[PDB]
Amino acid sequence: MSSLSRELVFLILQFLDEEKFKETVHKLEQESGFFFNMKYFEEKVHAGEWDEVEKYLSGFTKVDDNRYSMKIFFEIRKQKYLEALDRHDRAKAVDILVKDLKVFSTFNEELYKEITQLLTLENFRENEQLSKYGDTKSARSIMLIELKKLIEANPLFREKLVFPTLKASRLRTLINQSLNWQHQLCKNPRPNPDIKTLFTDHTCT
Amino acid sequence: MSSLSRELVFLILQFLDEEKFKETVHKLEQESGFFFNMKYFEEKVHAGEWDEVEKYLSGFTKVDDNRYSMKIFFEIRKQKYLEALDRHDRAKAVDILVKDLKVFSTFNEELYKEITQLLTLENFRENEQLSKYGDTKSARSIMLIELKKLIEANPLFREKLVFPTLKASRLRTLINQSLNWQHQLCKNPRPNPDIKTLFTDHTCT
Amino acid sequence: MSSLSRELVFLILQFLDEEKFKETVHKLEQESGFFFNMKYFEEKVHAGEWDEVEKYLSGFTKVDDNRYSMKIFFEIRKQKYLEALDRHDRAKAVDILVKDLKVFSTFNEELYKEITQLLTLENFRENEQLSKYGDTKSARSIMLIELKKLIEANPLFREKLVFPTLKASRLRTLINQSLNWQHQLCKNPRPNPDIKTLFTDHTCT
Amino acid sequence: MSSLSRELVFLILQFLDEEKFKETVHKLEQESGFFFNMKYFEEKVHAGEWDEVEKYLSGFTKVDDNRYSMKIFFEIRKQKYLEALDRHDRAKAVDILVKDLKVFSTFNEELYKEITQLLTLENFRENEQLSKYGDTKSARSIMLIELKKLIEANPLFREKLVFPTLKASRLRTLINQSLNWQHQLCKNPRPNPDIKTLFTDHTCT
Ligand SMILES: [Zn+2]
Ligand SMILES: [Zn+2]
Ligand SMILES: [Zn+2]
Ligand SMILES: [Zn+2]
């Protein structure tokens, strides 16, 4: 990608945002990987939308890319696991444990064991290190504080967190310059003409 | 929305498509509801991605909007139900039947009953009207033929199926006209300058 | 079986009952099929022990033996089904419906359909014929009244419901007569000897 | 219980066995706890009937009564757990692990952990100590060899494994002695009379 093309994506993001296409904004953030939307991230975390949270992240980093990004995924999964335990759905908890969390065992063998053993407890708050886990809403919120730090420290992000500030609807302004450029080639030009389309250059007569 | 704004969305779609952002294209198709992508629809149907198929459709129509759109949803769900029956997951099949299909009972009470009764069969091919259902891949394909017709007949679609043909990267061309417009205001203009950004108007000196 | 042998079973039942071997009594009732214990039946019905209720019955009748015995099984299963629906375990309810209840469809096709359709309801009390079903304990109790009638009318039972009245521990009394018979063959007999065993005839000297 | 009464149970067992009441024999073995039927035990083990195996045992010992009986239960459960893992029903495996096996953790904390960790494996034969587990039929059989030893060594059993040998239908013989005793009191006695019943003493005239 040129830096032109890259910048154009940003204009487009602005536009989509202003046109209130909320889902389309975040697919583009993700697919381009140019801007990570914290506010959106927090929102989805709080809503416990784990499939989308992982999906959004996946446009910025893979699980093993570096240590920050590995802890980020680990934390998210862990919470997924615990919520399953709370609703006493141990069938799900197990599914998570093997499918999502097993990848982390290589890096710490003993912690994986210790987390596995939570399955056998009447309440995982019987573990003193997890004795603090209060309700879902709260755990999510406390975890979010941690994720924000991890992300801001992550070198794969650090340059993606701040939307370059620019005049509203820059794209629309640029578009206009092109319609003005089209008519200024018209001769003999009417003073104020009608636009046939954006699709093909305007003309007068 | 102005017709300007509407047309601009199309340029954007073209661009996103050319930049190979495939997911972002289809979110925008859906959220704008301006263009229904048949090819994409077929693809997702074949892949049995039912959650996304319904989601994509939902940008163009609700289930009860008209008779075509109601049969479209009905057909899709029905297949969802049958696939559940085939993998002998009758727990899912039941979930579908009450959650997704019940809405259709008002409109036909007896058919809902008749579909409900398929649960009790060793194989639903014991019903002669379903005796034809061959493998998944085939049923999907035959159903697709039916959906295509339903959609092309649906008045909510009929004006959304054909992408207005236009020169490649029209958006990029327009952008350029604006950079040319910017420099042509430069005086004394250098002959060929460097672009500082798309974000704020270019200048020379 | 001789009527001797048959009568001996009854003595044995008395004995087991007096020795408080409760499970062994009812296996013998079932396996011999000579006596149906109403009190036990009521108890198990109330406790919702369906697997044992069907098992106990199976020593007296099969499902299709006659019309009374067919309604008895049907009623029991139906309640099994409804209880599954109440705990909103529709996966179980379906399992019951195909495995246990399907056998009854031959005899009434339409009722099977009507019962099948209860799966789709938010609450099966939406059916006015089932609008009466109050709590489990109550439904069981009302159903029990019905079962008692069905059983007392069932010709396969009618001659099995009343335990022939007899002196306590008749078996023990008979045993004694045999030990008295053994010693009365002893000569020269001591007046009051010790029993070596029941296993082989007693002797003196 | 008198030793009379105890011996009478044995006669009864013989009788029930000869009358082919197979279920009633084993309920009585269990409820009396006087005789443990190895052959029956092997049979049920091979058939993987775990609920009945534990039930039968429960008439002879509780889980914590002594060390042999504790290993016996542990072994049985462990196999239950592994079979669940093989059919890849990890929901069941977990159910077993917490409900049945947790009791054993007190006595060995680390082994419980090590067994818990088998849940996360693609195949538990990845553990070299379980690398030997071949098919179900075989594992059951090898385990049976082990159980037989454990039982024969268990002091709660050691005196319960051998059925005292006695003439066929001893009970029937004893019964007869009582009918002979009844008629020998008849005077004037007919030479060969008819038995009115076993229920009340016979008489002549
Ligand atoms: Zn013009
Ligand atoms: Zn310039
Ligand atoms: Zn004597
Ligand atoms: Zn006599």
Residue type, D153: A
Whole-number Å distance between alpha carbons of C165 and C142: 30
Query: How many Å is the Cα radius of gyration of chain D?
Result: 24
Whole-number Å distance between alpha carbons of D81 and D78: 5
Nearest ligand (C-alpha, residue A191)? 1
| D27, D175, D195 ranked by CB distance to C174: nearest | D175
Dihedral sign (CA B171, B172, B176, B179): positive
Whole-number Å distance between alpha carbons of C164 and C7: 10
**Smallest Cα distance from B90 to chain C, Å:** 7
Chain B residues with beta carbon closer than 8 angstroms to that of C94: 90-91, 94, 119
Per-position DSSP letters for C17-40, written without gaps between them = HHTT-HHHHHHHHHHH-S---HHH
Domain presence at residue D71 = yes
Chain centroid, CA D132 distance in Å: 28
Per-position DSSP letters for chain A, written without gaps between them = --HHHHHHHHHHHHHHHHTT-HHHHHHHHHHH-S---HHHHHHHHHTT-HHHHHHHHTTT--TTSSHHHHHHHHHHHHHHHHHHHHTT-HHHHHHHHHHTSGGGTTT-HHHHHHHHGGGGSSSGGGSTTSTT---HHHHHHHHHHHHHHHHHH-TTTTTSSSPPP--TTHHHHHHHHHHHHHHTT-SSPPSS-----SSS-----
Chain A residues with beta carbon closer than 8 angstroms to that of B175: 4, 8, 174, 178
**Residue D81 has which token pair?**
């757990």
Q: Is A109 exposed, middle or buried (0-12, 13-18, 19+ CB in 10 A)?
A: exposed
CB contact at 8 A, A57 and A154: no
For A101, which residue in chain D has the nearest alpha carbon? D120
Comparing CA positions, the residue from C49, C119, C129, C120 lying closest to residue C84 is C119
Whole-number Å distance between alpha carbons of B144 and B42: 7
């939308």: which residue's tokens?
Answer: A49
Chain centroid, CA C172 distance in Å: 26
CB contact at 8 A, B30 and A33: no
Roughly what angle, to the nearest 10 degrees, separates helices C136-153 and C67-86? 170
The secondary element (H helix, E strand) that includes residue C181 is: helix C170-183
**Smallest Cα distance from A127 to chain B, Å:** 35
Domain presence at residue B87 = yes
CB contact at 8 A, A132 and A126: no
Domain presence at residue D113 = yes
**Quick one: DSSP state of residue C179?**
H
Interface D:C, ≥3 CB–CB pairs < 8 Å: yes
Whole-number Å distance between alpha carbons of C167 and D199: 8
Whole-number Å distance between alpha carbons of D205 and D199: 18
Report the 10 Å Cβ neighbour count for B51. 9
For C102, which residue in chain B has the nearest alpha carbon? B120
Query: How many Å is the Cα radius of gyration of chain A?
Result: 24
**Residue D41 has which token pair?**
């035990």
Whole-number Å distance between alpha carbons of C6 and C32: 9
Comparing CA positions, the residue from A137, A138, A156 lying closest to residue A70 is A156
Whole-number Å distance between alpha carbons of D122 and B74: 40
**Quick one: DSSP state of residue C54?**
H
Dihedral sign (CA D144, D150, D155, D159): positive
Residues 6+ apart with CB under 8 A from B36: B29, B60, B151, B157, B160, B161
Residues 6+ apart with CB under 8 A from A80: A50, A96, A100
3-state secondary structure chain D: CCHHHHHHHHHHHHHHHHCCCHHHHHHHHHHHCCCCCHHHHHHHHHCCCHHHHHHHHCCCCCCCCCHHHHHHHHHHHHHHHHHHHHCCCHHHHHHHHHHCCHHHCCCCHHHHHHHHHHHHCCCHHHCCCCCCCCCHHHHHHHHHHHHHHHHHHCCCCCCCCCCCCCCCCHHHHHHHHHHHHHHCCCCCCCCCCCCCCCCCCCCCC
The secondary element (H helix, E strand) that includes residue C111 is: helix C109-116
Residues 6+ apart with CB under 8 A from B161: B35, B36, B38, B151, B152
Chain centroid, CA B33 distance in Å: 9
Distance B16 CA to ligand 2 centre (A): 29
Whole-number Å distance between alpha carbons of A177 and B179: 8
**Residue C32 has which token pair?**
């011999």
* 3-class secondary structure, C101: coil
Count, residues in chain D: 205
Nearest ligand (C-alpha, residue C191)? 3
Comparing CA positions, the residue from A98, A103, A96 lying closest to residue A51 is A96
Domain presence at residue A1 = yes
| B23, B31, B164 ranked by CB distance to A31: nearest | B23
Residues with CB under 5 A from ligand 2 (ion): B 183, 186, 189, 193, 204
**Quick one: DSSP state of residue C125?**
G
**Quick one: DSSP state of residue C161?**
S
CB contact at 8 A, D181 and D198: no
Interface B:D, ≥3 CB–CB pairs < 8 Å: no
Count, residues in chain B: 205
Distance C190 CA to ligand 4 centre (A): 27
**Number of folded domains in chain B?**
1
Distance C54 CA to ligand 2 centre (A): 94
* 3-class secondary structure, C114: helix
* 3-class secondary structure, C96: helix
Residues 6+ apart with CB under 8 A from D157: D36, D60, D61, D151
Domain presence at residue B204 = no
How far, in Å, are A121, C184, D205 from residue D184 at the CA level?
A: 72, 12, 13
Whole-number Å distance between alpha carbons of B178 and C116: 68
For B103, which residue in chain C has the nearest alpha carbon? C120
Whole-number Å distance between alpha carbons of A86 and A95: 15
Whole-number Å distance between alpha carbons of C86 and C124: 8
Per-position DSSP letters for A106-138, written without gaps between them = TT-HHHHHHHHGGGGSSSGGGSTTSTT---HHH
Whole-number Å distance between alpha carbons of D203 and D205: 7
Domain that holds residue A141: 1-165
The answer, yes or no, to whether the previous bond of A188 is cis (omega within 30 of 0) is: yes
How far, in Å, are B21, B151, C105, D73 from residue B18 at the CA level?
A: 8, 26, 60, 67
Report the 10 Å Cβ neighbour count for B144. 16
Whole-number Å distance between alpha carbons of C204 and C192: 10
Domain presence at residue B34 = yes
Whole-number Å distance between alpha carbons of C55 and D190: 47
CB contact at 8 A, D12 and D29: no
**Residue C41 has which token pair?**
């039946």
Comparing CA positions, the residue from C7, C197, A47, A98 lying closest to residue D179 is C7
**Residue D140 has which token pair?**
């059951």
Q: Do B172 and A8 touch (CB under 8 A)?
A: yes
Q: Is D57 exposed, middle or buried (0-12, 13-18, 19+ CB in 10 A)?
A: buried
Which long-range CB contacts under 8 A does C60-66 form with residues at least 24 apart? C60/C30, C60/C33, C60/C36, C60/C156, C60/C157, C60/C160, C61/C154, C61/C156, C61/C157, C63/C103, C64/C103, C65/C156, C66/C154, C66/C155, C66/C156
Question: Please, what is the end-to-end C-alpha distance for chain C in angstroms?
Answer: 40
Residues 6+ apart with CB under 8 A from D133: D82, D124, D125, D139
CB contact at 8 A, D75 and D41: no
Distance B162 CA to ligand 1 centre (A): 29
Which long-range CB contacts under 8 A does B54-62 form with residues at least 24 apart? B55/B30, B56/B26, B56/B29, B56/B30, B58/B30, B59/B29, B59/B30, B59/B31, B59/B32, B59/B33, B60/B30, B60/B33, B60/B36, B60/B156, B60/B157, B60/B160, B61/B154, B61/B156, B61/B157
Residue type, A160: K
Chain D residues with beta carbon closer than 8 angstroms to that of A90: 91, 94-95, 98
Distance B5 CA to ligand 1 centre (A): 20
Whole-number Å distance between alpha carbons of A29 and A23: 10
Domain presence at residue B160 = yes
Per-position DSSP letters for C58-85, written without gaps between them = TTT--TTSSHHHHHHHHHHHHHHHHHHH
Distance B178 CA to ligand 2 centre (A): 12
Nearest ligand (C-alpha, residue D201)? 4
* 3-class secondary structure, C185: coil
């098919």: which residue's tokens?
Answer: D135
Per-position DSSP letters for chain B, written without gaps between them = --HHHHHHHHHHHHHHHHTT-HHHHHHHHHHH-S---HHHHHHHHHTT-HHHHHHHHTTT--TTSSHHHHHHHHHHHHHHHHHHHHTT-HHHHHHHHHHTSGGGTTT-HHHHHHHHGGGGSSSGGGSTTSTT---HHHHHHHHHHHHHHHHHH-TTTTTSSSPPP--TTHHHHHHHHHHHHHHTT-SSPPSS-----SSS-----
Distance C14 CA to ligand 3 centre (A): 29
Report the 10 Å Cβ neighbour count for D112. 19
Q: Do B97 and C117 touch (CB under 8 A)?
A: no
User: Which among C77, C94, C106, C111 is the top mutation candidate for probing chain B, defined by the most B β-carbons within 10 Å of its own β-carbon?
Assistant: C94
CB contact at 8 A, D170 and C198: yes
**Residue C132 has which token pair?**
């009466």
* 3-class secondary structure, C148: helix
Whole-number Å distance between alpha carbons of C152 and C144: 12
Residues 6+ apart with CB under 8 A from B102: B112, C120
Dihedral sign (CA C4, C9, C10, C11): positive
Comparing CA positions, the residue from B29, B171, B14 lying closest to residue A7 is B171
**Residue C20 has which token pair?**
């408080």
Q: Do B8 and A164 touch (CB under 8 A)?
A: no
For D11, which residue in chain C has the nearest alpha carbon? C199
The subunits that touch chain D, with at least 3 C-beta pairs less than 8 Å apart, are A, C
How far, in Å, are D7, D9, D18 from residue D171 at the CA level?
A: 11, 10, 11
Distance C173 CA to ligand 3 centre (A): 18
Q: Cα C87–C89–C92 angle (5° rounding)?
A: 125
State the structure-solving technique. Answer: X-ray
**Residue A145 has which token pair?**
């504080």
Whole-number Å distance between alpha carbons of C55 and C69: 14
CB contact at 8 A, B73 and B54: yes
Domain presence at residue B200 = no
**Quick one: DSSP state of residue C119?**
G
- Stated in angstroms to one decimal place, the resolution of this structure is 3.3
**Smallest Cα distance from A31 to chain B, Å:** 6
The subunits that touch chain C, with at least 3 C-beta pairs less than 8 Å apart, are B, D
Report the 10 Å Cβ neighbour count for C8. 21
* 3-class secondary structure, C110: helix
